[PDB]
Amino acid sequence: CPRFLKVKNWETEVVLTDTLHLKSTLETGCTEYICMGSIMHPSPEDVATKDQLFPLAKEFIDQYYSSIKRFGSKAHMERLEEVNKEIDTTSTYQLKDTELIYGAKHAWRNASRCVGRIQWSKLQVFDARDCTTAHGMFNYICNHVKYATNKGNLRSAITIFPQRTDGKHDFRVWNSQLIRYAGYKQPDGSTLGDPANVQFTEICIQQGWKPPRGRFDVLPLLLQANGNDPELFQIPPELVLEVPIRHPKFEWFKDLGLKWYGLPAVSNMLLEIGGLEFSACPFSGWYMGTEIGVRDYCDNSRYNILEEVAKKMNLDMRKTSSLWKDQALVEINIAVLYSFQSDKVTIVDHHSATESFIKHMENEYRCRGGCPADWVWIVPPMSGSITPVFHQEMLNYRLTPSFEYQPDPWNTHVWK
Amino acid sequence: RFLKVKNWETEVVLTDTLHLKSTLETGCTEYICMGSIMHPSATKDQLFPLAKEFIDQYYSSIKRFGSKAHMERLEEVNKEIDTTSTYQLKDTELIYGAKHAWRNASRCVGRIQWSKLQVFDARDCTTAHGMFNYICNHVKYATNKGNLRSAITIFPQRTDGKHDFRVWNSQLIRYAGYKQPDGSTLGDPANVQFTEICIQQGWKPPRGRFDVLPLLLQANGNDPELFQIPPELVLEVPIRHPKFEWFKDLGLKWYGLPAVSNMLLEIGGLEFSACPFSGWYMGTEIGVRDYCDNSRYNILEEVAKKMNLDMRKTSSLWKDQALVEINIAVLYSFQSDKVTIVDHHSATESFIKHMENEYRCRGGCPADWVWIVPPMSGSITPVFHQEMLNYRLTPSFEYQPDPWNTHVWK
Ligand code: HEM
Ligand code: HEM
Ligand SMILES: Cc1cc(N)nc(CCc2cc(CC[C@H]3CCCN3C)cc(F)c2F)c1
Ligand SMILES: Cc1cc(N)nc(CCc2cc(CC[C@H]3CCCN3C)cc(F)c2F)c1
Ligand SMILES: C[C@H](O)[C@H](O)[C@H]1CNc2nc(N)[nH]c(=O)c2N1
Ligand SMILES: C[C@H](O)[C@H](O)[C@H]1CNc2nc(N)[nH]c(=O)c2N1
Ligand SMILES: [Zn+2]
């Protein structure tokens, strides 16, 4: 690979120079002859051997001690030796609290699909590696939700549960996000609530959940500790902050009966630090408006409200070239931003978020030598080219520490 | 190395085998993806395998692979490369190659039309006047009083690089841009430099906001020469709005004919440095990019003004609101004037159908998601949810250096 790669911004002519890609550790899926950049998941029961672990841990320890300006120091060399001995006698090792916090923040810093990374160094890390049971995981998650929600002044946070050992004792949050609404398939084929969550909702009902069978039922937590069968818990409703959606101009918009939860909290990803694997690491931030207003509400396979809103706006819905869909989509995103700001719940519009991200990316290029970014994910799902990231060339590559996808736990779990 | 592509909205999975036939590079590697980079990084010896590859897929396409005609053509091409260091395509091959360069353009959402392409052979052209005549004929044919027809005009191929045919205009029809004294810009700011070359070469600019630029045509590597396209051949549309009667007062118009004139067509190793090609517009090309890019006509603030929108906070989405009304106007205007145009909903829908057609009959369809997804309302169009594999097949349309950076002025 060449040492310097240039990216251009075609609106501002600004050229940036990337050297950080030389530290790339994993494959992207692309080859010299094919690009897989719009494949969502490009290409087990298998843990790192001693020989796989030694270099992965050294690389991370080296990076950590470089970051604290102690590279080559006595503490650096001693930490290397202690880690090496630990791997040698136990085939794994335990991170220091300092190292865990650094690794978590850097997995966020390295997350190429995240437009909100200007915040990466302001992350509250909750060390839950002493957890042994699902009830304990419930306690940790509740504290996380309460801390991160903060009565609407949201704060980013991650709670990290014990790392993988042999792969038969995994900690998992079976929920894909901590807070989501149930979906219910009807006999007649229609769906009530969130159609994306019909499968998981069915799992919870089989596990014992009594469903309200409404349009916005918060799902219970399904929590697996130490490889045991998962267990159900209801999140105390006073910890689930929600925003009813109204429109500043259209008095009828509240009559739609829409609301959404304030806290986006991903709970199905895997956090990889120095070759260690944290299979339960729920992390949360605050929303960009389009995540709710474009995808959650207007995806055809989700709540799918464009028609109903277009009807109440009295739009001509016979020709697509009237752009009735586009007009309604804007008003829905105006309502979402307006309802969150009125209730003083942190949210960020896609103009402000992408402008912030360009500033972040430029700083990272200057101070770090690059900033991996996935353009397909960074550009918002509406009004793409009137945001600055549309015009920004990006380079995508995989740095470690990192958040990874992992198989859904109901597909792998060995029921006791 | 059968590759699967999924649509996350419909769950349709298609299987790609066609990528096994590519040999040009993408710019990515196993460790770095350059999918959002706009431009990532002959002789007798290089030429015959490239020619043989192209003749092979041609005769494979008419289902006479290994036929007597096929065998004879290969030998004919061999001797011609021997004795002349190049070769000439048959008319059938020229047409096949041009349609297939369009078919293979990963960045084109309009490829469902790929085989309906009128191909104008201009390989006998020798002068800029002849180029002008061929180009006027293309424009007139393609415009067709509003019922636009896809066309391409193919001028003589590159020989030694010192006798290149070039259209110096990036597109056949564009508006001029002028650097104003007070620092601002009149017209189209994307063209300020090309406009200045035309002025330097003798063009008398009217210094308005929608001045159609003259043609600047270079034949056989000579100095380029200026020509005015006859105005009756340049179809234009006044943009107005079905509900906002004040919109016509903005004074906006656009031309009906999108015609790329700065790319290079490669076919069996031959390079056609002048190959103007044209189709019809997707509304967002004018309404989102041309009118609302900050570095282009940049009209958003004005439109939002007349709409009386709250422009103090970005979270009012005033820009998004104005953007939709502008794009409603463009579609409404072209449609009212019976000028062929397609909205991004209909176009992307056609492209998904095209992808399905191509996977079935051809085993795949190279597509660049970054370019295929429209610049507004992305995820309410079906291509947003469609995984695409990008790879480079030949014949192809390639970028080439701008002629003013290479030409030695004679
Ligand atoms: C603090 C405010 C944050 C904002 C505004 C933000 C914004 C976003 C958005 C809009 C996406 C695209 C999501 C989608 O389309 O599904 C995303 C993805 C992502 N974010 Fe951030 N995020 C924030 C916080 C965080 C934090 C705290 C972490 C981790 C510690 C994180 C890690 C990620 C990752 C890994 C992805 C990729 C997810 C995937 O591939 O499914 N983000 N973010
Ligand atoms: C017939 C109607 C057509 C429609 C609606 C259409 C639509 C589009 C659009 C929207 C783009 C993106 C352009 C941009 O953002 O600058 C594009 C790109 C492209 N089109 Fe098509 N197109 C059509 C016809 C054609 C024809 C006739 C050809 C050639 C024979 C062609 C070849 C290409 C190529 C090579 C590109 C890529 C240009 C680049 O990389 O800058 N298209 N098309
Ligand atoms: C920390 C953080 C901040 C922030 N602004 N957004 C996020 C993502 C939030 C999020 C993500 C998903 C998965 C979407 C997946 C599944 C289906 C299609 N997509 C690929 C579901 C949710 F409910 C949700 F809230 C995280
Ligand atoms: C055959 C065909 C059909 C169709 N609907 N559209 C096209 C493209 C039309 C087109 C393209 C450009 C270049 C824009 C530049 C600016 C920066 C990045 N882009 C490369 C200028 C134009 F005036 C123009 F009409 C071709
Ligand atoms: C940086 C990025 O590659 C660049 O802005 C691209 C993005 N996608 C595009 N898509 C289309 N159709 N046309 C364009 O000019 C661009 N520009
Ligand atoms: C097929 C395509 O990769 C898929 O729809 C992607 C496109 N870009 C995205 N971008 C974001 N932020 N979130 C998404 O879910 C997607 N989906
Ligand atoms: Zn790639």
Q: Do A341 and B315 touch (CB under 8 A)?
A: yes
Alpha-carbon gap, residue A50 to A87, rounded angstroms: 6
Instruction: Give the end of a domain, one of B346, B361, B380.
Output: B346
Q: Which residues pair with B353 in a beta bridge?
A: none
Give B259 to chain A, closest Cα distance, Å: 21
Number of H helices, E strands in chain B: 11, 18
**Closest B-chain CA to A34:** B391
Q: Which residues pair with A125 in a beta bridge?
A: A158
Cα B108 to averaged position of ligand 2 atoms, centre (Å): 4
- SS3 annotation, B60-77: HHCCCCCCHHHHHHHHHH
DSSP conformational letter for A392: B
Indicate whether B221 belongs to any domain: yes
Starting at the edge strand that comes first in sequence, how are the strands of the sheet with A276-278 ordered?
Answer: A276-278, A270-273, A402-404
What residue type is B235 in one-letter code?
Answer: L
Same domain membership, residue A252 and residue A206: no
Which of A378, A390, A392, A394 to probe ligand 5 with, by most ligand atoms within 8 A of CB?
A390
Same domain membership, residue A217 and residue A125: no
C-to-N gaps above 2.5 Å in chain A, after residues: 43
Q: Which of B30, B316, B384 sits opposite A381 (nearest CB)?
A: B384
Cα B210 to averaged position of ligand 3 atoms, centre (Å): 45
Q: Do B28 and A27 touch (CB under 8 A)?
A: no
Alpha-carbon gap, residue B29 to A365, rounded angstroms: 21
Alpha-carbon gap, residue B381 to B373, rounded angstroms: 8
Contact by Cβ (8 Å): B353, B326: no
- Protein residue with its CA nearest to atom 12 in ligand 6: A377
Indicate whether B28 belongs to any domain: yes
Same domain membership, residue B154 and residue B168: no
CA distance between the termini of chain B: 52
Ligand with smallest separation from the Cα of B281: 4
* Annotation marks residue A286 as catalytic: yes
Residue B177 main-chain phi, psi, to 5 deg: -125, 140
Indicate whether B394 belongs to any domain: no
What residue type is B219 in one-letter code?
Answer: A
Give the position, in ligand 3's atom list, of the atom nearest the Cα of B8.
18
Alpha-carbon gap, residue A413 to B308, rounded angstroms: 58
B313 Cβ contact list (under 8 Å, min separation 6): none
Same domain membership, residue A186 and residue A312: no
Is the Cβ atom of B293 under 6 angstroms away from ligand 2? no
Same domain membership, residue B154 and residue B42: yes
Same domain membership, residue A96 and residue A214: no
Is the Cβ atom of A391 under 6 angstroms away from ligand 5? yes
Region for residue A10 given its phi and psi (left: phi exceeds 0; alpha: psi -120 to 50; beta: otherwise):
alpha
Residue A231 main-chain phi, psi, to 5 deg: -130, 150
Total domains, chain B:
3
Q: Is the peptide bond before A2 cis (omega within 30 degrees of 0)?
A: no
- Protein residue with its CA nearest to atom 13 in ligand 6: A377
Ligand with smallest separation from the Cα of B37: 5
Angle ∠(B141,B143,B145) on CA atoms, nearest 5: 105
Q: Which of A10, A27, A34 sits opposite B389 (nearest CB)?
A: A34
Beta strand pairing call for B118-121 and B151-154? parallel
Give the position, in ligand 6's atom list, of the atom nearest the Cα of B6.
1
Same domain membership, residue B111 and residue B30: yes
What count of residues does chain B have?
A: 410
Contact by Cβ (8 Å): A131, A113: no
Same domain membership, residue B268 and residue B240: no
Residue A242 main-chain phi, psi, to 5 deg: -135, 155
Same domain membership, residue B92 and residue B105: yes
**CATH code, domain with A60:** 3.90.340.10
Alpha-carbon gap, residue B58 to B3, rounded angstroms: 25
With H, G, I as helix, E, B as strand and everything else as coil, classify residue A121. coil
Q: Which residues pair with A276 in a beta bridge?
A: A273
Same domain membership, residue A254 and residue A229: no
What resolution (Å)?
Answer: 2.0
CA distances from A407 to A200, A347, B6, B99 (A): 14, 30, 18, 44
Instruction: For helices A74-90 and A50-67, give the axis angle rounded to 10 degrees.
Output: 160
Alpha-carbon gap, residue B30 to B18, rounded angstroms: 20
Which residue bears the tokens 């004018």? Answer: B286
A205 Cβ contact list (under 8 Å, min separation 6): A211
CB contacts, 8 Å: A299 with chain B? 9, 379
Cα B182 to averaged position of ligand 6 atoms, centre (Å): 43
Alpha-carbon gap, residue A101 to B296, rounded angstroms: 45
DSSP conformational letter for A382: S
Contact by Cβ (8 Å): A42, A81: no
Indicate whether B4 belongs to any domain: no
DSSP notation for B323-385 = HHHHHHHHHHHHHHTT--EE-HHHHHHHHHHHHHHHHHHHS-----HHHHS-SSSGGGSGGGG
Nearest by Cα to B286 from B333, B250, B319, B246: B333
Which of B36, B167, B235, B260 to probe ligand 4 with, by most ligand atoms within 8 A of CB?
B260
What residue type is A13 in one-letter code?
Answer: E
Alpha-carbon gap, residue A292 to A177, rounded angstroms: 14
Indicate whether B408 belongs to any domain: no
- SS3 annotation, B292-312: HCCCCCCCHHHHHHHCCCCCC
C-to-N gaps above 2.5 Å in chain B, after residues: 41
- Give the DSSP H or E segment for B15: strand B13-16
Cα B151 to averaged position of ligand 3 atoms, centre (Å): 45
Nearest by Cα to A263 from A148, A172, A176: A148
Residue A318: Cβ within 10 Å count: 8
**CATH code, domain with B214:** 3.90.440.10
Same domain membership, residue A107 and residue A160: yes
Give B267 to chain A, closest Cα distance, Å: 19
Nearest by Cα to A29 from B286, B194, B224, B3: B3
User: In A173-206, which positions are buried (b, 16+ CB within 10 angstroms) versus exposed (e)?
Assistant: bbbbbbbbbbbbeeeeeebbbbbbbeebbbbbee
Residues with CB under 6 A from ligand 3: A 116, 177, 180, 264, 266, 283-285, 287-288, 291
DSSP conformational letter for A189: S
Give the position, in ligand 1's atom list, of the atom nearest the Cα of A287.
5
Alpha-carbon gap, residue A315 to A331, rounded angstroms: 12
Alpha-carbon gap, residue A196 to B286, rounded angstroms: 36
**Closest A-chain CA to B295:** A11
Is the Cβ atom of A393 under 6 angstroms away from ligand 5? yes
Look up the domain containing B196 and give its range.
124-149+164-235+399-403
Same domain membership, residue A251 and residue A216: no
How big is chain A by its Cα radius of gyration, in Å? 23
Region for residue B221 given its phi and psi (left: phi exceeds 0; alpha: psi -120 to 50; beta: otherwise):
left
CB contacts, 8 Å: A298 with chain B? 379-380
Give B165 to chain A, closest Cα distance, Å: 28
Indicate whether A391 belongs to any domain: no
CA B375 to chain centre: 16
Contact by Cβ (8 Å): A271, A401: yes
Which residue bears the tokens 């001029």? Answer: B176
Indicate whether A396 belongs to any domain: no
Cα B261 to averaged position of ligand 2 atoms, centre (Å): 12
What count of residues does chain A have?
A: 416
Residue B189 main-chain phi, psi, to 5 deg: -65, -20
Nearest by Cα to B220 from B274, B182, B297: B274
* Annotation marks residue A324 as catalytic: no
- Decide: residue A238, CB within 10 A, 0-12 exposed, 13-18 middle, 19+ buried: exposed
**CATH code, domain with B333:** 3.90.1230.10
Beta strand pairing call for B215-218 and B177-179? unpaired
CA distances from A283 to A105, A264, B24 (A): 11, 8, 42
B294 Cβ contact list (under 8 Å, min separation 6): A11
Contact by Cβ (8 Å): A200, A176: yes
CB contacts, 8 Å: A21 with chain B? 31-32
What residue type is B384 in one-letter code?
Answer: F
**Structure obtained using:** X-ray
Q: Do A385 and B33 touch (CB under 8 A)?
A: no
Give the position, in ligand 1's atom list, of the atom nearest the Cα of A157.
27
Alpha-carbon gap, residue B279 to B337, rounded angstroms: 17
Indicate whether A384 belongs to any domain: no
